[PDB]
């Protein structure tokens, strides 16, 4: 019931493992965007950065999830 | 390399099974939206409607994926 842009790293860590790439891609589409028609879905990128984000969120449980996504994503 | 908003049902069917809920959520965040701050990620919904979408795309391989998502999603 919490909008994704208000999740903390704790909220994300409570999402079942199988749907953690989905939360990351959701947050990416939502935020990190140009124009909807140009938005590309980089399945290798999401697959690669999700574990990084799970680790980052574990060490920083009250940070904003979407900001961690944007951050991790930039630093590869 | 194809923006998600230009995928046909065929493009979606070529995505590995494990990343098909991610493609559906991505398409939803992208399109089916109010305001980013209010966008909610309904993980049960995405889990339930993905198989429906895979089936609908199978019987309509040249239909636009994102439109199929919006459609399936509406009809439960």
- Domains of chain A, residue spans: 1-76
Dihedral angle, C-alpha A2, A23, A14, A53, nearest 10 °: -120
Q: DSSP state, B62?
A: T
Q: How far is B25 from chain A (nearest CA, A)?
A: 6
Pick the residue of B36, B45, B64, B67 with the most A CBs within 10 A to test the interface with A by mutation: B36
Specify whether the CB–CB gap between B4 and A41 falls below 8 A.
yes
Fold of A1-76: 10k-s Protein, Hypothetical Protein A; Chain A (1.10.890)
Token couple for B60: 């309509």
Pick the residue of B22, B38, B69 with the most A CBs within 10 A to test the interface with A by mutation: B22
Dihedral angle, C-alpha B55, B16, B34, A61, nearest 10 °: 140
């Amino acid at each position: 019931k919490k909008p994704v842009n208000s999740w903390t790293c704790e909220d994300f860590l409570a999402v079942d493992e199988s749907f953690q790439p989905t939360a990351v891609g959701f947050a990416e589409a939502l935020n990190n965007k140009d124009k909807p028609e140009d938005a590309v879905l980089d399945v290798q990128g999401i697959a690669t950065v999700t574990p990084a984000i799970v680790q980052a969120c574990t060490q920083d449980k009250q940070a904003n999830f979407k900001d961690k996504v944007k951050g991790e994503w930039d630093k590869i």
